[PDB]
Ligand SMILES: *SC[C@H](NC(=O)CC[C@H](N)C(=O)O)C(=O)NCC(=O)O
């Protein structure tokens with residue numbers, strides 16, 4: 101009773117040399133859920149690379165029923181870092197009891213699908229390939245011209261977004277931002293690989309396990325690898341403390357990252373899990389030896405620095421979508437669909 | 453539901469008079485209400501006077517169940533603590549998962565009920581204070597059982613130290629009763645009204661109420677710690693803790709009744725009953741100190757607290773909360789050291 105994630109089927113790229121998918125403003129779209137850490141990676145990267153006006157964004161409802169992600173039945177919204185969803189601008193979730201699973205609050209629960217009016221993401225999948233027979237996942241990077249799915253693998257979408265493909269369409273400060281610098285690329289790929297299996301996906305192999313033996317194995321594995329991240333960050337903090345002195349908290353945080361001394365894709369990919377860990381994964385996926393906030397001081401400093409001090413993280417993080425999606429959609433974990441109010445707050449302030 | 457058997461034991465009682473070897477206490481180690489009675493039985497020196505047996509932690513549709521002298525007169529009926537995945541719900545580890553029922557060989561606690569009252573139609577709860585002579589239930593309300601135990605009824609059969617222990621001293625009775633009253637509604641029962649709510653509106657109301665009242669207990673204890681620190685100095689933790697209680701400056705029934713909820717809070721109520729604004733260990737330092745002092749320094753608390761029974765009971769029995777019956781491994785540890 102283990103969880104075996106399907107492999108994504110749409111794995112193409114965008115480039116000037118490409119025969120079909122060439123770069124342009126106003127041609128590609130990013131369809132996401134704000135609940136989904138994989139899709140979350142693509143929203144952070146789109147903001148950091150200055151692509152919000154180049155690639156529009158729409159947002160499915162947080163509630164996932166048996167027919168898959170759905171939309172509700174504007175230029176500021178499409179080019180907003182979170183598709184215009186108002187809760188992503190908030191730093192904490194509030195009451196949930198009055199929100200039903202059929203809630204239809206336009207630009208709060210979801211956006212529409214603004215090009216074809218589709219009600220289901222499955223519609224995009226079947227437009228691209230009428231013979232598709234896998235799961236209808238987010239994120240989707242969509243090409244308006246051919247009406248196909250270019251890529252639905254978040255690890256590749258974020259490399260496309262960071263690549264030179266869209267450089268003609270952004271300001272030179274954003275062009276220069278590089279989330280996968282060559283000097284760090286192999287370290288980034290090494291770190292990503294083990295964080296993928298043991299944390300990003302590890303929390304899902306833990307929470308979706310249907311046999312307790314598999315639950316126990318996977319939860320032990322999650323916390324063993326958080327310990328490894330904590331160790332990496334603790335050693336890094338110690339070196340920064342030596343370099344700049346404990347009193348210079350702002351120069352220290354300016355270099356306080358998982359890989360190297362700059363923000364990279366490694367931080368983005370870890371963040372989308374860690375920022376969900378205390379709000380959902382502890383209670384809902386039973387990943388509860390300890391919490392980030394209580395048990396992992398260096399991870400907790402690192403994630404708070406990213407959340408509070410980087411708009412691309414803060415304003416793509418929607419704690420209402422996060423909590424409601426998991427607790428209201430996973431009937432075999434939470435049969436009555438009651439969303440826990442805690443922990444409070446969703447992410448603590450960065451107190452010095 | 454309100455408990456049906458509400459009799460007492462006393463030298464004047466027409467039926468139930470005090471004696472050694474006459475009365476029995478049937479408990480679950482998972483149930484906080486029954487846990488109150490075990491703690492009180494130990495504090496009052498009654499383990500040889502009043503035997504104990506222990507139902508299985510798993511609660512199925514036919515009610516609490518048993519497996520098919522050193523143990524009877526032990527603080528926890530002889531149960532010893534042995535991952536959870538290898539433990540199935542029908543596990544049969546003698547003196548680990550449960551005891552038998554030694555007097556009649558009954559497999560079900562409903563058998564005791566039906567013997568006492570063949571027309572019984574309510575729930576088959578623990579704790580049960582049983583009379584071996586008449587084969588009836590004397591009392592099945594934990595708040596009364598602990599007053600029977602603390603009363604003068606069994607004084608002839610205990611040593612002189614225990615006879616003198618008074619968990620409800622008259623000098624503190626209005627303070628104890630006041631604290632017990634709101635702690636019962638908002639904390640002891642508050643966690644169940646939260647965890648068993650079937651409508652989110654009810655869950656949210658009750659969980660806010662739980663933490664609002666934990667805040668009140670925390671203030672009480674914070675204020676008490678402040679005065680103790682000034683009276684003894686902060687380095688003299690031993691003298692301070694010897695007076696660090698919820699009511700007064702001595703150990704009372706108020707501490708006992710609070711403890712059986714607080715000791716279950718981080719191991720289970722946070723995750724399982726969604727009482728998760730914060731945890732005791734992370735969010736309530738004075739409660740946290742108070743509960744560790746009782747657990748680590750008082751044998752009547754420590755050796756009646758079984759974290760395996762606690763975590764397994766709730767996670768394995770409540771199908772509408774945890775449909776697959778997978779017991780979370782955390783938090784680690786069950787109770788932090790002192
Ligand atoms: S903790 C398990 C339950 N005990 C009680 O409800 C005792 C409540 C009394 N008010 C008391 O003694 O304090 C229990 O036994 N549940 C079984 C059931 O079927 O409800």
Ligand SMILES: N[C@@H](CCC(=O)N[C@@H](CS)C(=O)NCC(=O)O)C(=O)O
Pocket residue numbers: 108135136137138139168235236237238239252253254255
């Ligand atoms: N490997 C994919 C995983 C994407 C994914 O699985 N998303 C989940 C939710 S976060 C989803 O869309 N699930 C829909 C389903 O499986 O029905 C990626 O990284 O992009």
